């Protein structure tokens, strides 16, 4: 900061930094909601299970990109554990990764789809592009 | 002149590049985060504006899903992922530049590598990971301003390795199975014998390929090399794609900057009203920001719907050129590039497709005297195909698109009526192979 | 013009468009297909029509054996275009309504300046004459927001209409290539028959 | 009937007119003059709305340049300005009109 500047704003007039008036240190301000989150679901009335995609978050960072200490326990279940899967489009949690490719049911992105699939689970997989074939030229 | 005709004595194989946009950035907006900026008080006021945010998110979700349809319906036209053949030269035609190269891990062709280098993305890619915006003072960035205001780009469903996998399959089938690839299960054909069939599709006799095949292959190879030399040195060929990138970047940048507007409130900064005014009278100021910001956001969604319809119209056209130019041979003039269409090869490009149109171009035309009909013995003979032509001493039939003079036999011609009716009839002899 | 609305002239003046027309018909009259595929190759026009009859699947003789009838029918049919264009009032309706729509859009935009939008007056000088900044600015903002909203409407409508004109322009460009520079097998693309 | 066919014994040459729009009037708006007239006071308040005017002018400039594309891509398809032939009748076909 400049020696007399008290806060900083970006091109959006979002106040992104502030000088602490007591210590004179500079604090960054981040939005509470930061980043995109999207919920995978089959229909309600087929399962209440869901999976969560943290659209640009790194799977070890999910417990901090989400403020998992401030969340309810029922959400914090979706912050960690088994069934984390680092896709592109960020970390997917709550769907088990499966090595069989299938036609795309729910399009998650960056090559990944998910489906409610055989108990049943939400499973995530890479799309099959098509049938493998060769021409005996 | 009413009695002379120009026939091409030669031809050139031309390869022509057509660049088509197919998709745009799958933009997404957290409408509450944009308007009310995490403040709880404003969010209560935004509830009193009802369903506007839901309707805006629904619209942008339609745009996004449609971008995958556009990409799928262009590239995923072939259900069979015909793997790249081990040998890249067929009959002398060298496909090595448009097929993938196993010398690299990326399954792009060499041409596609140039295409993916020749366009620069405004973010260099969708990622700006969680920690990356909390940077130095110089590290302020319009992309971080976008994230802090709830604006994001979703990645496409098909990754570039998948688009390149489809184009590799399409060129592999085209290199090895011709038209049948579009009509059904791809049927193996020798490529020179496939090109011979495509010459008949022009109306050049099948021999003209085999009788010149080494020249034709050399011209094809050189033309593909001239594409590569242009795509390395050019700065403008993919402008139809870079300007789609630029337009969508600029639309988001103006949207975040529009948060700096006051819209007639005492301040552009929502915290600054809430800091400074009581709820009795802040709400009057907050409402001006809510309505103004919400108006700016609906402007963006409307123009995206406009731009998406334009891209979708372009994607439908690219999907038509894939079917008509790649999976077959098109009689539609200038549809599959200039010249008579022979073949097309699809190549992937960032948010687009590139068609290498291969066409026959007639060259070195020569003037000949010509006649509509021959009168042999009081009855008029017409060409079955082509035109009667005189080389100066002797009358022949030739095909129109390539000078190949043939003896005027009773096979090349059909007879109709006494030869008095046709104006410009001439008296040359018609040879009958039986009589000698 | 007083309110800042203007029409810019087209880049190609009508004499330049007419010059391209003249070249296109001249090539069609003298070189046929070759005009599209490459350097245009001279062909006698009766002999070009004979080829275009084969394109239908009518044997080449049927032209030469009837050429005077065909030429007369062609000439009369062109004359019937002239006689109808001299006497119709509606054949170009698809163009007159493109003129009318864009004129009407501008006329409603200037008339929208007569709106108050809930200000004390539609007239900006009248507010500024009558009120002090402390409270003029409230009234001025109601005019600014309403007027700026009226521009955003107009520009949206133009973007919609321009997309429609693209579709027609791309189609007309396709008919130039497929119908003028060639012969089309597409059943009903270049007119009936 | 399963065993009879109709064959045309004759034909008519037809000429048909298809009318197509290709461009529209290129339009330009001075967003400041439209909103504020000449009043300096209103122009200062309009600055507090920022880029709306710039964004509107950019949009209409896109329309305008696109109208020249539409005309060029229809008519300028041939690079050769083949001069009009001196004789307007070929084989009996009278191009003079
Ligand atoms: C068409 O023209 C090309 C050149 O414009 C001819 O190809 C050349 O032929 C000579 C003699 O065979 C070679 O020495 C050259 O290297 C060739 N160059 C190229 C670029 O092909 C070709 O022979 C002509 N075709 C016909 C049928 O006459
Ligand atoms: C096909 O074309 C290439 C030229 O593009 C020929 O040469 C190869 O070119 C690539 C780069 O383009 C190099 O990485 C290779 O090392 C080149 N190989 C050789 C032997 O020069 C290639 O040989 C051609 N293939 C055939 C079968 O003719
Ligand atoms: C098709 O019909 C037209 C008339 O509708 C025929 O033209 C007439 O032919 C007769 C005899 O040749 C002349 O007496 C008339 O004056 C012609 N009329 C016109 C308007 O040209 C024409 O011959 C018919 N076509 C065929 C192939 O039989
Ligand atoms: C071609 O058509 C015209 C009719 O439009 C024939 O007649 C001439 O037409 C123009 C107007 O288009 C008049 O100014 C001339 O005075 C007309 N001349 C005559 C002699 O009628 C014209 O003769 C036709 N040309 C040919 C070669 O047949
Ligand atoms: C008071 O302010 C001064 C100067 O900002 C700072 O050094 C100090 O730590 C603050 N608090 C106390 C208890 O002195
Ligand atoms: C986390 O991000 C780093 C780079 O910031 C990357 O190397 C790593 O792969 C990411 N996490 C995972 C699980 O891939
Ligand atoms: C999927 O395959 C990979 C192959 O490297 C393996 O590491 C992984 O354990 C497999 N997962 C399952 C669920 O089979
Ligand atoms: C064909 O004839 C015309 C007229 O004499 C002449 O101008 C032209 O150059 C000739 N073309 C060739 C290829 O001989
Ligand atoms: C015309 O073709 C015949 C082929 O038999 C040839 O003998 C003659 O020399 C040719 N004339 C010219 C002028 O090329
Ligand atoms: C061609 O034109 C000449 C005059 O240049 C004329 O004598 C001849 O009859 C015409 N023939 C044809 C078939 O047009
Ligand atoms: C063609 O032959 C007939 C009979 O020999 C003759 O009457 C006619 O004049 C000839 N025409 C030409 C152009 O030689």
Describe the fold and architecture:
The PDB classes it as biosynthetic protein. The structure is cut from a larger assembly and holds four copies of chain A. With 137 residues, chain A is mainly beta. Helix content of chain A is 6%, strand content 34%. Chain A has two helices and twelve strands, in the order E-E-E-E-E-H-H-E-E-E-E-E-E-E. Chain A has a four-stranded antiparallel sheet with strand order 4-5-7-6, with no helix packed on it. In chain A, strands 8-11-10-9 form a four-stranded mixed sheet, with no helix packed on it. In chain A, a hairpin with a 6-residue loop joins strand 2 (15-19) and strand 3. Chains in contact: A-B, B-C, B-D, C-D. At the C-D interface, strand 1, helix 1, helix 3, helix 5 and helix 6 of C face strand 1, helix 1, helix 2, helix 3 and strand 3 of D. Strand 12 of chain A pairs parallel with strand 3 (80-82) of chain B, so a sheet runs across the interface. A molecule of 2 linked components (NAG-NAG) binds at residues 89, 94, 96-97 of chain B.
């Amino acid at each position: 900061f400049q020696p007399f500047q008290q806060f900083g704003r970006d091109v959006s007039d979002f106040t992104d930094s502030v000088r602490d008036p007591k210590t004179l240190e500079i604090l960054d301000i981040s939005p509470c909601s930061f980043g995109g989150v999207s919920v995978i679901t089959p229909g309600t009335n087929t399962s209440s299970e869901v999976a969560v995609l943290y659209q640009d978050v790194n799977c070890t960072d999910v417990p901090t990109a989400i403020h998992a200490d401030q969340l309810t326990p029922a959400w914090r279940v979706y912050s960690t554990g088994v069934n984390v899967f680092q896709t592109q489009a960020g970390c997917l949690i709550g769907a088990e990764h499966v090595n069989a490719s299938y036609e795309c049911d729910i399009p998650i992105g960056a090559g990944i789809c998910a489906s409610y699939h055989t108990q049943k689970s939400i499973v995530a997989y890479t799309m099959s592009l098509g049938a493998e074939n060769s021409i005996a030229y | 002149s009413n009695n002379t005709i120009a026939i091409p004595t030669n031809f050139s194989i031309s390869v022509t590049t057509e660049v088509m946009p197919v998709s745009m950035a799958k933009t997404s907006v957290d409408c509450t985060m944009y308007i009310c900026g995490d403040s709880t008080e404003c969010s209560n006021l935004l509830l009193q504006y009802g369903s506007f945010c839901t309707q805006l998110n629904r619209a942008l979700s339609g745009i996004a899903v449609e971008q995958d349809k556009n990409t799928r319906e262009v590239f995923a036209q072939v259900k069979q992922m015909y793997k790249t053949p081990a040998i890249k030269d067929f009959g002398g035609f060298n496909f090595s530049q448009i097929l993938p190269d196993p010398s690299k891990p990326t399954k792009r062709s060499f041409i596609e590598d140039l295409l993916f280098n020749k366009v620069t993305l405004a973010d260099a890619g969708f990622m700006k990971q969680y920690g990356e915006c909390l940077g130095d003072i110089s590290a302020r960035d319009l992309i971080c301003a976008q994230k802090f205001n709830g604006l994001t780009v979703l990645p496409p469903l098909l990754t570039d390795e998948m688009i390149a996998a489809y184009t590799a399959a399409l060129v592999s089938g085209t290199a090895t199975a011709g038209w049948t690839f579009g009509a059904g299960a791809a049927l193996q054909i020798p490529f020179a014998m496939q090109m011979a069939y495509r010459f008949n599709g022009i109306g050049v006799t099948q021999n003209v390929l085999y009788e010149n095949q080494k020249q034709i292959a050399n011209q094809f190879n050189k033309a593909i090399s001239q594409i590569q030399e242009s795509l390395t040195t050019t700065s403008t060929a993919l402008g139809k794609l870079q300007d789609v990138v630029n337009q969508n970047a600029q639309a988001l940048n103006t949207l975040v900057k529009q948060l700096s507007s006051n819209f007639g409130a005492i301040s552009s900064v929502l915290n600054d009203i809430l800091s400074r005014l009581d709820k009795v009278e802040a709400e009057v100021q907050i409402d001006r920001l809510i309505t103004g910001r919400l108006q700016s956001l609906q402007t963006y969604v409307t123009q995206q719907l406009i731009r998406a319809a334009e891209i979708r119209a372009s994607a439908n056209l690219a999907a038509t050129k894939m079917s008509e130019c790649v999976l077959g041979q098109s009689k539609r003039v200038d549809f599959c590039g200039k010249g008579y269409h022979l073949m097309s090869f699809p190549q992937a490009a960032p948010h687009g497709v590139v068609f290498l149109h291969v066409t026959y171009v007639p060259s070195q035309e020569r003037n000949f005297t010509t006649a509509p009909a021959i009168c042999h013995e009081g009855k008029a003979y017409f060409p079955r195909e082509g035109v009667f032509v005189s080389n100066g001493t002797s009358w022949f039939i030739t095909q129109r698109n390539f000078y190949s003079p043939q003896i005027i036999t009773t096979d090349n011609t059909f007879v109709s009526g006494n030869c008095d009716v046709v104006i410009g009839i001439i008296n040359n002899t018609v040879y009958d192979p039986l009589q000698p």
